[PDB]
């Protein structure tokens, strides 16, 4: 009928020659929709395969000896690491911009801005700006509640005043999610059960200033839930953002499936939530009203990034299939109005988000 979301397949890494074996969390990265790095090993010559999303058919291969590679969100500047050794190269100008040696192994790192790399070690989190001659800065000490977890994600609000680290572990025969929410201003951490989340800016009607929101999904003991709350003291003169909560569904077949990704379109004010096993959920950022929900991938999804173009969400799955999902501006309203029979939400989305 009509869908309130458009789905699209942009690539099949396997048609590019990549080995399925390297299509996974620890060997294929996608820091942004502009590139995809895959570490393969032909003979004992490990090497990275960079894929320009604008030239899928021309992947450049280069010998590397890094245990991890992560291309910058906006340019052919790449971060490589080997143990405590970190180097950033400007591929195009064939040079090493910066280099640093950590006094701990980095368990997980990722770009969190056009110029800043976040480094996670077993017990602390650092931010490393490429701006000038800067060296890692410890942002905060890991909370004991993540001790032992496999770190899977780090996120930040816009002003980098709220940080969210996330790890997952097996407990009770179920994937449990552990998150640490740290406030740069009040120097305080907060343990939160959660699997996926993201931050978002939002100007409530009647508010002069925007509001910083923290939205997370969790499949806890009470099943699936999704919260949306305002983080920190509201801007002077502003107003609270009512905390919102709504469960996230999980059919009976998906018994040990859980949330693995979350992008938020500030363009439509919606929350895309993907589960490990191919489920896509649409939620209104404002009310938390679950707009849509179906299955976009039979293979598991391990990585995603904002699809800037559509204001949606892009991602790779275990088969090498690169797919996206965005709001189908042409019908989101009609769908909400008719199919969902939610006149209020629809009247609001249109007006609010000028659809």
């Amino acid at each position: 009928q009509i869908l309130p979301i458009r789905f699209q397949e942009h690539l099949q890494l396997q048609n590019l020659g990549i080995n399925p074996a390297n299509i996974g969390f620890s060997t294929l990265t996608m820091e942004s929709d502009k590139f995809i790095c895959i570490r393969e090993k032909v003979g004992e010559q490990a090497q990275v395969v960079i894929i320009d999303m604008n030239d899928p058919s021309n992947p450049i291969r280069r010998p590397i000896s890094a245990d991890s590679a992560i291309m910058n969100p906006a340019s052919k500047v790449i971060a490589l690491k080997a143990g405590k050794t970190l180097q950033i190269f400007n591929i195009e100008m064939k040079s090493k911009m910066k280099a640093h040696t950590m006094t701990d192994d980095v368990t997980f790192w990722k770009w969190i801005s056009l110029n800043t790399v976040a480094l996670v070690t077993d017990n602390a989190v650092y931010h490393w700006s490429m701006e000038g001659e800067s060296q890692p800065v410890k942002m905060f000490d890991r909370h004991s509640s993540l001790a032992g977890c496999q770190i899977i994600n780090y996120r930040t609000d816009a002003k980098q005043k709220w940080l969210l680290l996330t790890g997952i572990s097996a407990q009770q025969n179920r994937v449990v999610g552990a998150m640490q929410l740290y406030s740069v201003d009040r120097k305080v951490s907060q343990p939160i059960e959660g699997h996926a989340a993201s931050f978002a800016q939002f100007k409530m009607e009647g508010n002069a200033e925007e509001s910083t929101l923290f939205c997370f999904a969790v499949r806890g003991q009470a099943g699936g839930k999704l919260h949306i709350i305002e983080v920190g003291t509201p801007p002077t003169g502003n107003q609270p953002f009512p905390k919102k909560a709504v469960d996230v569904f999980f059919p009976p077949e998906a018994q040990n499936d859980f949330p693995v990704a979350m992008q938020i379109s500030e363009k439509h004010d919606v929350v895309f939530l993907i589960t490990k096993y191919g489920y896509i959920h649409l939620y209104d950022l404002e009310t938390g009203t679950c707009i849509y929900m179906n299955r976009i991938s039979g293979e598991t999804i391990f990585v995603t990034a904002p699809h800037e173009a559509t204001a949606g969400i892009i991602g790779v799955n275990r088969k090498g299939q690169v797919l996206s999902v965005c709001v189908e501006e042409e019908n989101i309203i009609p769908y909400i109005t008719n199919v969902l029979q939610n006149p209020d939400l629809a009247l609001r989305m249109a007006v609010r988000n000028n659809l």
Binding site: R62, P63, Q87, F89
Partner: peptide, 9 residues
């Protein structure tokens, strides 16, 4: 020292 990346050279 040694580079983690080799770009011809």
């Amino acid at each position: 020292a040694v580079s983690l990346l080799d770009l011809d050279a």
